[PDB]
Amino acid sequence: QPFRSDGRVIYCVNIIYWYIRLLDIFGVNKYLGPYVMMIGKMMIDMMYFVII
Amino acid sequence: LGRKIYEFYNAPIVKFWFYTLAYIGYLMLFNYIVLVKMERWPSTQEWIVISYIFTLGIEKMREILMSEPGKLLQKVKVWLQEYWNVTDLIAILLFSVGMILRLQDQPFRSDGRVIYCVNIIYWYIRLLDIFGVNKYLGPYVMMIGKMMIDMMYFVIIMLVVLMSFGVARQAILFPNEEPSWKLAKNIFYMPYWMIYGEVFADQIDPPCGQNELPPCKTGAWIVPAIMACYLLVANILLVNLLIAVFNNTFFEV
Amino acid sequence: MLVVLMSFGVARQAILFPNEEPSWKLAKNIFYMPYWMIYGEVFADQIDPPCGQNELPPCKTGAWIVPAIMACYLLVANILLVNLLIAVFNNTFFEV
Ligand SMILES: CC(C)CCC[C@@H](C)[C@H]1CC[C@H]2[C@@H]3CC=C4C[C@@H](OC(=O)CCC(=O)O)CC[C@]4(C)[C@H]3CC[C@]12C
Ligand SMILES: CC(C)CCC[C@@H](C)[C@H]1CC[C@H]2[C@@H]3CC=C4C[C@@H](OC(=O)CCC(=O)O)CC[C@]4(C)[C@H]3CC[C@]12C
Ligand SMILES: CC(C)CCC[C@@H](C)[C@H]1CC[C@H]2[C@@H]3CC=C4C[C@@H](OC(=O)CCC(=O)O)CC[C@]4(C)[C@H]3CC[C@]12C
Ligand SMILES: CC(C)CCC[C@@H](C)[C@H]1CC[C@H]2[C@@H]3CC=C4C[C@@H](OC(=O)CCC(=O)O)CC[C@]4(C)[C@H]3CC[C@]12C
Ligand SMILES: CC(C)CCC[C@@H](C)[C@H]1CC[C@H]2[C@@H]3CC=C4C[C@@H](OC(=O)CCC(=O)O)CC[C@]4(C)[C@H]3CC[C@]12C
Ligand SMILES: CC(C)CCC[C@@H](C)[C@H]1CC[C@H]2[C@@H]3CC=C4C[C@@H](OC(=O)CCC(=O)O)CC[C@]4(C)[C@H]3CC[C@]12C
Ligand SMILES: CC(C)CCC[C@@H](C)[C@H]1CC[C@H]2[C@@H]3CC=C4C[C@@H](OC(=O)CCC(=O)O)CC[C@]4(C)[C@H]3CC[C@]12C
Ligand SMILES: CC(C)CCC[C@@H](C)[C@H]1CC[C@H]2[C@@H]3CC=C4C[C@@H](OC(=O)CCC(=O)O)CC[C@]4(C)[C@H]3CC[C@]12C
Ligand SMILES: CC(C)CCC[C@@H](C)[C@H]1CC[C@H]2[C@@H]3CC=C4C[C@@H](OC(=O)CCC(=O)O)CC[C@]4(C)[C@H]3CC[C@]12C
Ligand SMILES: CC(C)CCC[C@@H](C)[C@H]1CC[C@H]2[C@@H]3CC=C4C[C@@H](OC(=O)CCC(=O)O)CC[C@]4(C)[C@H]3CC[C@]12C
Ligand SMILES: CC(C)CCC[C@@H](C)[C@H]1CC[C@H]2[C@@H]3CC=C4C[C@@H](OC(=O)CCC(=O)O)CC[C@]4(C)[C@H]3CC[C@]12C
Structure with missing residues (x-):
């Protein structure tokens, strides 16, 4: 310390x-993978929401 | 009139x-049982409830032994095909073990x-099967059933995001805890009630x-920032995707 | 919603108050706390007291079930059927 608790x-x-890297493991499933890339698509629309 | 009684009674909408x-x-009798107290021996109303569950189990056993296939394994197979029958069997067994623990004095009684x-x-949920007869409510019931899988997908990704906010909250703020299962409560306690309104506004950045x-x-400022990130991702992204999915x-459905 | 709400009402008013007499206030407490939980107030103080x-x-005894099942109720009410009402509307x- 004082560096220990900061590490x-x-x-x-x-x-x-x-935890967010579990999405790569989620990309093998035929029902989950397209949902993951779909979230990746919706992020831009939420970005426009974020500015306004 | 003596055949007219038979004609009305054995008609299937009547039955x-x-x-x-x-x-x-x-169900009204069972509500009066479970809300109101229960003494050492069961009451009259409860005896009606016990009798309903037991004679229902007799009917289920009978209808197992009046299905066409020759083997007993084949009859329990074709009976296990329909899901409401096996959930019926599970609930009847749980109510019977609850009855056995009830007739037994404390401490087993309140566990019963x-x-x-x-x-x-x-x-209560079997009234949905009762609602299935309606031409306007039956399709709604099957609709609930068909969107449960679409909610299941949501549930796994929500567990992934919710645990992120949970671990980072429980391991910034509370730093010095011995091995105890209570941490697992906190892990799924505070983030989960944030989806449905309550932001726990008093306890973000005391x-x-x-x-x-x-x-x-040290580092207790990152907890409001990650709560901002989780709150945006949980209530603005994924619930709104579930709107879109539905x-x-x-x-189609 | 009436069916799911009252199954919660029965479960909470059964576990939490175990020695209640016949009174109509039970019929108030079966609807009171589930209903204002749809609209954005989960009654945070009395979740796991x-x-x-x-x-x-x-x-x-058995009080630990009361938060858990309520978790289930909030997934059924605010996430499933209101969202189906979005879809229905x-x-x-x-047409309309
Ligand atoms: C728990 C708190 C701190 C919130 C954390 C939010 C972000 C760290 C995560 C949540 C969801 C993630 C997104 C989920 C899905 C994707 C798709 C994935 O990209 C691909 O699969 C490549 C193809 C494509 O761009 O669709 C990785 C980026 C992205 C936008 C992720 C970027 C990082 C995000 C926004
Ligand atoms: C027509 C179909 C849809 C069924 C309708 C149900 C009613 C006819 C039942 C359901 C619950 C019953 C009640 C459940 C409990 C009681 C308490 C009972 O009083 C006692 O047991 C006194 C002792 C005590 O309460 O400690 C008198 C009958 C009464 C009002 C019952 C009256 C008849 C009720 C309203
Ligand atoms: C099966 C469904 C459709 C409900 C049908 C209603 C009635 C046929 C039953 C249901 C509950 C019964 C009641 C349950 C409890 C009692 C208390 C009972 O009083 C006692 O047991 C105390 C005195 C004693 O032990 O003799 C008198 C009958 C009564 C009112 C019963 C009257 C008949 C009721 C209303
Ligand atoms: C407070 C909490 C615990 C409430 C949770 C409610 C769910 C456990 C229920 C509500 C609606 C039910 C569904 C309503 C309709 C159906 C259709 C039914 O399936 C069939 O009729 C198909 C039979 C076959 O094809 O063999 C039974 C399962 C299912 C999905 C049910 C599964 C259980 C569900 C999701
Ligand atoms: C992807 C998901 C499922 C990950 C979930 C991670 C955590 C919620 C779990 C994983 C391992 C768990 C730990 C595994 C073992 C223990 C020991 C346990 O110790 C005792 O009960 C003491 C008994 C004794 O040894 O005398 C206390 C809970 C704890 C720390 C657990 C706390 C919760 C942990 C960290
Ligand atoms: C797929 C959906 C249905 C959720 C995934 C299941 C798990 C993430 C859940 C289901 C039941 C949960 C458990 C239910 C009960 C407990 C006991 C609980 O113990 C205490 O709270 C005792 C200490 C205290 O007094 O707080 C710790 C969390 C834990 C292991 C929970 C950890 C997370 C579990 C395994
Ligand atoms: C539409 C959205 C994307 C814009 C607004 C989101 C962020 C820019 C805001 C939301 C909440 C804010 C946080 C709320 C509270 C705090 C705690 C604060 O910590 C302290 O002041 C230290 C403790 C002390 O007060 O002594 C540091 C800023 C921070 C992280 C804020 C940083 C900016 C945040 C993340
Ligand atoms: C299933 C969905 C669509 C509707 C469910 C909501 C209603 C069935 C519930 C929700 C709140 C309930 C109310 C909550 C409190 C009261 C006050 C109560 O009056 C008292 O307790 C008297 C005042 C006192 O206690 O001094 C009478 C019942 C009433 C109107 C309840 C009637 C039934 C209500 C409207
Ligand atoms: C399954 C769904 C659709 C309906 C659920 C109905 C129950 C919640 C109702 C129906 C019968 C009701 C009971 C009918 C009679 C009484 C007696 C009543 O006693 C008095 O009013 C005392 C009068 C006096 O002082 O003499 C107290 C409420 C109570 C237990 C009621 C409590 C609420 C009950 C169980
Ligand atoms: C949602 C649509 C389809 C109709 C719903 C009708 C019932 C679910 C509601 C309508 C009026 C309600 C009643 C309005 C008034 C009362 C009196 C109330 O009594 C008290 O609060 C006593 C005072 C006290 O709490 O001390 C108990 C709930 C009750 C029976 C309510 C129970 C639920 C009822 C029957
Ligand atoms: C998968 C997604 C949709 C998240 C699902 C959330 C659940 C996994 C969490 C939310 C609330 C949690 C519950 C909150 C509180 C408790 C009470 C706790 O009981 C005790 O600690 C007993 C001691 C006491 O409270 O006096 C046991 C874990 C439990 C049921 C938790 C189990 C896990 C639950 C149901």
Whole structure:
């Protein structure tokens, strides 16, 4: 410390991305994969929502 | 008139609305059982409820033993084909073990009461089968059934996002906890009630390091930012996709 | 919604209050808390109230079911049937 708990915070932010990487495993399923790329399509529309 | 009684009674719409009114009667009696207290021995109203479940089980056993296929395995196979029959069997067995724990004195008695009120849920849901006779409600029932899979997909991706907000909240704010299962409660507690309204507004960024406070935990500013991210993704993206899924599946189903 | 709402009403008013007499206030409490939960108020204080501790009135046994099933109810009411009402309102709109 004082660096130790900040490294813990860095681990804590990294578990966010290591959950989001489950979408790659979700991309093998014939029912889930198109839904994942579909979310990737809807992100732009939500971006326009975010500016307005 | 002596054949007219038989003509009315054995007619199938009549024999259906008998069963509907008997189901409504049983369900009102079971509500009076489970809400009101229960003594050491069962009451009269509860004896009616016990008798309904037992004679229903007799009818289910009978209708197993009046199906055409020759083998007993074949009869239980063709009976296990229809899903409401096997859920009927499961609920009847759970109510019977609840009855056995009820007739037994405490502490088993109130556990039996718990089993009773968990069967209350399913014996409410069987009124959907009762609603299936209507030409306007039957298709709605099958519609609920067909969009449950579209909700299932939503449920897995919601678990993935909800656990993200959960772990990052439980591991920024609370930093020093021994191995305990209580963390698993917190993991699925606070993020899940945020979808349906309640943002838990008092407990996002408590005031801290002030004189009036407990010491500020390092990095506690990232929790409102990730709650912003989760709240936008959960209530603006995926629920709205579920709107879209449901509409474009409605025209087909 | 009436069927699903009252199954929740029965379940919560059964587990939480275990020694209630015949009274019509039970028929109020069966509808009261489920109904204002559709509209954006989940009654956050009484979701999993702390019980059986020293810091309180004890836990009714089986109370841990009451949050869990309520989770299920919020997935049925606010996510399934209101969304089907969106769909129902939307693809009969052209006709009407
Ligand atoms: C829990 C809190 C912190 C919210 C976290 C939000 C983001 C970190 C995640 C949530 C959903 C993710 C998106 C889900 C789906 C996709 C598609 C995927 O891209 C592809 O599959 C490539 C093809 C395509 O672009 O569609 C990865 C990017 C993207 C937009 C993801 C980008 C990162 C996002 C916005
Ligand atoms: C089967 C469905 C369609 C309901 C049909 C209603 C009636 C045929 C039954 C259902 C509940 C019954 C009641 C359940 C409990 C009681 C209390 C009972 O009083 C006692 O048991 C206390 C005195 C004693 O033990 O003798 C008198 C009959 C009564 C009113 C019963 C009268 C007949 C009722 C209304
Ligand atoms: C026509 C079909 C749709 C069935 C309609 C159901 C009614 C005829 C039943 C359902 C619940 C019954 C009630 C359930 C409980 C009681 C309490 C009972 O009083 C007692 O048991 C006294 C003892 C005590 O309460 O401790 C008197 C009958 C009554 C009002 C019952 C009257 C008949 C009711 C309203
Ligand atoms: C408070 C919580 C616990 C409520 C949860 C409700 C669900 C568990 C229920 C409500 C609607 C039900 C559905 C309504 C209609 C049907 C159709 C029915 O299937 C058939 O008739 C097909 C039979 C065959 O083809 O062999 C039974 C399953 C299903 C999907 C049901 C499955 C169970 C569901 C999703
Ligand atoms: C993709 C999803 C399913 C991941 C979910 C992750 C966590 C919610 C789980 C995974 C492993 C779990 C841990 C596995 C083992 C234990 C030990 C357990 O210890 C005891 O019960 C003490 C008993 C004793 O050893 O005397 C306390 C819960 C804990 C930390 C669990 C807490 C919750 C954890 C972290
Ligand atoms: C696919 C859908 C239906 C959800 C996926 C299932 C799991 C994510 C859920 C289902 C039941 C849940 C469990 C139900 C009960 C408990 C006990 C609970 O223990 C306590 O809360 C005791 C400590 C305390 O006093 O808080 C910890 C979470 C846990 C393991 C839950 C962890 C998450 C589980 C396994
Ligand atoms: C339409 C959307 C995309 C625009 C608005 C979203 C963000 C720009 C906002 C929403 C909530 C805001 C957060 C709300 C509260 C805080 C806590 C705050 O922490 C502190 O001040 C430290 C503690 C203290 O007060 O002593 C730092 C800014 C931050 C993360 C804010 C940063 C900006 C955020 C993420
Ligand atoms: C299934 C969906 C579509 C509708 C479900 C909603 C109603 C059946 C419920 C919701 C709230 C309930 C009300 C909540 C509270 C009261 C007050 C109550 O009056 C008292 O308790 C007297 C005042 C006092 O307690 O001093 C009379 C019943 C009433 C109107 C209830 C009647 C039934 C209501 C309207
Ligand atoms: C299954 C769905 C469609 C309907 C559910 C109906 C129940 C919630 C109702 C029907 C019968 C009702 C009972 C009928 C009679 C009474 C007696 C009543 O007692 C008095 O009013 C006391 C009078 C006095 O002081 O003498 C208290 C409510 C109670 C238990 C009622 C509670 C609510 C019940 C169980
Ligand atoms: C949703 C559509 C299809 C019609 C719904 C009708 C019933 C579900 C509602 C309509 C009026 C309601 C009743 C209005 C008034 C009362 C009195 C109320 O009594 C009290 O609150 C007593 C005072 C107290 O709480 O101390 C209990 C609920 C009850 C029976 C309500 C029960 C539910 C009822 C019958
Ligand atoms: C898959 C997506 C749709 C998320 C689903 C959320 C569930 C997995 C979560 C939400 C609320 C959770 C419940 C919230 C509170 C409790 C009480 C808890 O009971 C105790 O801790 C007992 C001690 C006490 O409370 O006195 C056991 C876990 C449980 C049922 C949790 C189990 C897991 C639940 C149902």
